[PDB]
Amino acid sequence: LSELSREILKENGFVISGENLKMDRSDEEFVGLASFNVLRLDEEEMYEGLIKEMKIKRKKKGFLFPANTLLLSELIKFLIGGIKGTSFDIETLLRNSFRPDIFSTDRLGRLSSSVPALKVYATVYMEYKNVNCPLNEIADSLEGYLK
């Protein structure tokens, strides 16, 4: 996640566990963790294992909800993995999901521009093949995703 997205999530009451690197600050006697053999472990293995357990949990009973988070996790996953989304699109989606008073007017970039383009592609494919192709259906599905 970007720094602005993390700041928006932290302002909404979310804390991201997985980056729990409290950098040892108050000068006094942290005793009770000297039982792990860290010296015989690879740093690359720990770096690979720390990324794979990144979970965002809430600490306060604010105005954010299980259903919106449950939808938004898969929406962000489909935005990054399913399509070639950018961090500005993530910030736009988070602003549209959390802050309705801020008018982020159509800052999703490539997908909104790709809405008519695949329809024109499908128009050309129908006009040159006369065989049904789901390019228009893919464009309509991602348009419904924008809806």
**Rg of the chain over CA atoms, in angstroms?**
22
CA angle 35, 39, 45 (to 5 degrees): 105
> Which method was it determined by?
cryo-EM
Quote the tokens at residue 102.
């801020």
Quote the tokens at residue 74.
């898969």
Task: Return d(Cα 8, Cα 14) in angstroms, integer.
Answer: 9
Which residues does the chain break after (C to N > 2.5 Å)? none
Please name which of 146, 147, 68, 70 lies closest in space to residue 108, comparing C-alpha atoms.
146
| Residue 12 CB neighbour total at 10 angstroms | 16
H helix or E strand, kind and range, residue 14: strand 14-17
Bridge partners for 16 per DSSP: 56
Distance between alpha carbon 75 and the CA centroid of its chain, in Å? 7
Quote the tokens at residue 9.
């999530």
Task: Return d(Cα 100, Cα 9) in angstroms, integer.
Answer: 15
Please name which of 10, 17, 123 lies closest in space to residue 64, comparing C-alpha atoms.
10
| CA dihedral angle for residue 137, residue 73, residue 21, residue 34, rounded to 10 degrees | -110
Task: Return d(Cα 133, Cα 123) in angstroms, integer.
Answer: 10
Bridge partners for 15 per DSSP: 57
